[PDB]
């Protein structure tokens, strides 16, 4: 009972309240002394919970631990031993994002006089010592350097004045390592490839520049909240604890490190001239601010309303254009490559909640950011343009589809395939998918009708206007009657690789079920047997897709759901879809968005399929080994169907890369002959959609290295195509030798 | 910590289906492992296509069942959405609930699962009971409320 009174009392310290933060900590520390005789065991694991799970409130809880230690030396030692215990647990379990929070906590405890600075310097020079380890991934060296550098904003001033002869040895080792790192992969992870207005810097190079500037600034940083400074008198007499010598858990093959990152930057101080001056990109204040806001989201992402309140109530020890930091952090996550920390739709609803809570400030910062993203689309990463499209359309659908389109009227004068007009076209198609065609024609200015989507109506080949001279017109009219007569399958068989039998069957079935998705899925299920018969040939599957497209080419949403349903019901397979995406009938729609949504949706189905059957094998293996014959015989049959699913996976990627290499090279010869530049807008999208394949599924494609290098991406290919493959090799190389 | 594990959008609502076959205990059991959501406060003109586009943003949709008026057999202003996995329905519960569709705030609730007869409004006129006691005029909800 009083435990619950202790927990909620520890978690809520430092929130909004009448009393000052220092008065609350001094008071709380006093009641934790009283209850400590009885509840020492529980108070200990609660403080270990918040040090692990609440890094945003870091300095609040280190001060609290600092007060208890000054008054109770044996409690301070038990706590530090628990931290060392947990830091080893985390590194063993490959939870490195959680381990940095513990290192950072240990480091800040030095300011609280709980840990002696020499012990902390010893641990850090064992961190940087990982740079000397040989036959280990760069991502391992990167993380241990990051844990050191990212703790210095809090503990930097103290460690340097106390020991600067051994700190400079550490800095010298750090700078040596940073200069010899390979940055060949950064382009795949940048949201914009342009260096202006804001370069997208590799995260360690950014952090390094930030720490060195803090060093030249005499380790004076004006953002971190340091409550322990008011308790100097109490904390000067405290007895320090010495950390044991730290040994980094060795690198095994099961080790998983955080992959590299690029710092998202779209704001400087000129974007909010009236207001608190914005910390620069190379200031550690910018680093701490964003790190904390990212952590607030990580803690409260599941509750949108709470998450927004915690972002708005974020305390600093100096004022900052907070609305600009929030928007930038939220877009930094939505555009993070390869994938955002959380599901994408969360960021749309989090921004609405923020608008509700700051209706006079945030909505116009958000709108200012939307204009900026639009104006920088030229070099925006295609994976990020897609997320920008999906967010903006979903955002607008929650705000009456109201937008100042006139501000973007200058895209009407450009090539329709340029980034801005293509962005607007995709946005309006997404808005239609959330509303309906006529609504979108009414809300856009009359000058934007060229970017509006075609009306989504099916095209029936054997309709009234059709000529009786068309092949199979007669049979098409027989099917049209039999379907409405509720005819069974065999009757349809008698009414009918033959392309025309597929053509008349599909044309008629889709036409008669066009009212909704429910009717189309019902039709496929009722006559499923028919599909499997005349579409068993691989070229038959291809022709089902070809015909289905001819009917619904004006309704991209219907095409995606039908392709999805036919895969799940085994009418077509993933290889048929892959070959369909690159067929000539889709060449005009190739650059459009819905095509790549379909392809990626098909890949995700394959990938999810392999994982399911791998877990079966990775369960039966557990039963045999954990329990301990007949089980080994069942394992032999699982492994056989793990291999068969893994080879269809590999074939799906090899088809995609083949067709990609083919359409790209033949475009490169067509440009060489005609004697013209290679960079077509079409070319930009194509080459970037190739890079998207490597980037989205880099963990699976890693298995195909030798095949890809030796059979597909070879010296003979144009240097423009190899450039993409070598970026992908640089990426996987950073995390694997 | 209790605060960090908190999922206040995923918890069950006070609504319970009276036509459900069983007692409260086993209905609550079905709710907590259900992948199906009840979607309320829809415009009578909202189509299956619009619901697919919105609700797909949290995961893959297995089936959608539009609610109908038992007599007229027309859109009744609600539907059900069945996902393949529950995590996807949970995310629709957190982020899609309380947002707009056809410019109306929609409300999602966990459902015990679809069985025949649930697609029809239980109101005396054939529509939802919600629309029998309504006073204000609503264009997307079919005028006044008797």
């Amino acid at each position: 009972e009083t435990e619950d009174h202790l927990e909620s009392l520890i978690c809520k310290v430092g929130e909004k309240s009448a009393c000052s933060l220092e008065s609350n900590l001094e008071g709380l520390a006093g009641v934790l002394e009283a209850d400590l005789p009885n509840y020492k065991s529980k108070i200990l694991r609660l403080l270990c919970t918040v040090a692990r799970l609440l890094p945003e409130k870091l300095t609040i809880y280190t001060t609290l631990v600092g007060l208890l230690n000054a008054r109770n030396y044996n409690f301070g030692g038990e706590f530090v031993e628990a931290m060392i215990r947990q830091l080893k647990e985390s590194l063993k379990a490959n939870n490195y994002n959680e381990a940095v929070y513990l290192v950072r906590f240990l480091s800040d405890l030095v300011n609280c006089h709980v840990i002696a600075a020499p012990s902390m310097v010893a641990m850090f020079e064992n961190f940087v010592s990982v740079t000397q380890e040989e036959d280990v991934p760069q991502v391992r060296r990167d993380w241990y350097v990051y844990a050191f550098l990212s703790s210095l904003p809090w503990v930097g001033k103290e460690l340097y004045e106390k020991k600067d002869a051994e700190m400079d040895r550490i800095f010298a080792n750090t700078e040596s390592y940073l200069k010899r790192r390979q940055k060949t992969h950064v382009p795949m992870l940048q949201v914009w490839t342009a260096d202006k207005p804001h370069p997208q810097e590799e995260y360690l190079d950014c952090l390094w520049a930030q720490i060195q500037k803090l060093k030249k600034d005499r380790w004076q940083e004006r953002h971190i909240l340091r409550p322990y400074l008011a308790f100097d008198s109490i904390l000067c007499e405290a007895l320090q604890h010495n950390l044991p010598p730290f040994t980094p858990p060795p690198h095994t093959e099961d080790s998983v490190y955080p992959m590299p990152r690029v710092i998202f930057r779209m704001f400087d101080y000129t974007d909010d001239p009236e207001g608190p001056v914005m910390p620069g990109s190379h200031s550690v204040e910018r680093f701490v601010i964003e790190e904390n806001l990212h952590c607030i989201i990580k803690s409260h992402w599941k509750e949108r309303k709470t998450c927004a309140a915690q972002l708005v109530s974020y305390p600093g020890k100096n004022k900052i254009p907070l609305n600009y930091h929030i928007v930038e952090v939220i877009f930094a996550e939505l555009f993070q490559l390869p994938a955002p920390p959380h599901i994408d739709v969360m960021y749309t609803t989090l921004l609405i909640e923020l608008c509700k809570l700051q209706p006079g400030s945030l909505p116009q910062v958000l709108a200012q950011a939307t204009e900026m993203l639009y104006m920088r689309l030229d070099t925006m990463n295609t994976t990020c343009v897609d997320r920008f499209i999906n967010w903006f359309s979903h955002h607008l659908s929650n705000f009456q589809f109201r937008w100042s389109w006139e501000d973007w009227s200058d895209c009407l004068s450009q090539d329709p395939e340029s980034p801005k007009p293509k962005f607007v076209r995709e946005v309006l198609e997404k808005c239609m998918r959330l509303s309906y065609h006529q609504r979108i024609l009414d809300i856009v200015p009359p000058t934007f009708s060229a970017l509006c989507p075609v009306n989504p109506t099916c095209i029936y080949k054997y309709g009234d206007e059709s000529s009786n001279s068309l092949p199979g017109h007669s049979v098409a009219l027989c099917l049209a009657v039999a379907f409405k007569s509720k005819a069974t399958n065999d009757e349809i068989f008698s009414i009918l690789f033959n392309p025309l039998k597929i053509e008349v069957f599909v044309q008629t079935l889709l036409h008669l079920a066009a009212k909704s998705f429910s009717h189309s899925f019902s039709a496929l299920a009722k006559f499923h047997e028919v599909f499997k018969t005349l579409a068993e040939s691989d070229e038959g599957k291809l022709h089902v897709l070809r015909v289905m497209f001819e009917v619904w080419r004006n309704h991209p949403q219907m095409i995606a759901v039908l392709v999805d349903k036919m895969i799940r019901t085994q009418i077509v397979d993933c290889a048929a879809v892959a070959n369909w995406i690159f067929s000539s009938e889709l060449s005009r729609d190739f650059t459009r968005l819905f095509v790549w949504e379909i392809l990626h949706s098909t890949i995700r189905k394959m990938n999810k399929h392999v994982l399911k059957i791998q877990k079966e094998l990775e369960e039966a293996k557990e039963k045999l080994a954990r329990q301990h014959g007949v089980l080994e015989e069942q394992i032999e049959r699982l492994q056989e169907k793990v291999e068969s699913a893994q080879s269809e996976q590999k074939n799906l990627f090899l088809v995609i890369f083949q067709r990609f290499i083919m359409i790209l090279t033949e475009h490169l010869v067509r440009c060489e002959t005609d004697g013209t530049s290679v960079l077509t807008p079409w070319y930009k999208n194509c080459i970037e959609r190739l890079q998207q394949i490597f980037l989205q599924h880099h963990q699976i494609i890693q298995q195909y290295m030798v095949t890809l290098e030796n059979l597909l991406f070879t010296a003979e290919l144009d240097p423009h195509i190899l450039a993409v493959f070598q970026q992908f090799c640089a990426l996987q190389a950073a995390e694997n030798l | 910590l209790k605060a960090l594990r908190s999922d206040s959008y995923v918890e069950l609502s006070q609504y319970r289906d009276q036509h459900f076959r069983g007692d409260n205990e086993e209905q609550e059991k079905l709710l907590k492992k259900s992948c199906t959501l009840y979607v309320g406060n829809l415009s009578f003109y909202t189509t299956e296509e619009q619901i697919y586009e919105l609700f797909s943003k949290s995961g893959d949709i297995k089936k959608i069942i539009m609610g109908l008026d038992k007599m007229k057999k027309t859109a009744c202003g609600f539907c059900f959405v069945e996902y393949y996995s529950r995590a996807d329905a949970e995310n629709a519960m957190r982020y899609i609930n309380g947002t707009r569709l056809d410019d109306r705030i929609i409300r999602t609730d966990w459902d015990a699962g679809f069985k025949e007869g649930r697609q029809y409004g239980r109101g005396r006129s054939g529509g939802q009971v919600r629309d029998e006691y309504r006073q204000d005029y609503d264009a997307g909800r079919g005028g006044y409320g008797k």
Binding site: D4, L9, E15, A34 | -
Partner: peptide
């Protein structure tokens, strides 16, 4: 969850006055 839904001041001031 009786404690869980309270204000920080309410809890801190209840702990040191009561016991």
């Amino acid at each position: 969850s009786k404690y869980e839904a309270m204000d920080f001041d309410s809890l801190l001031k209840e702990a040191q006055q009561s016991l």
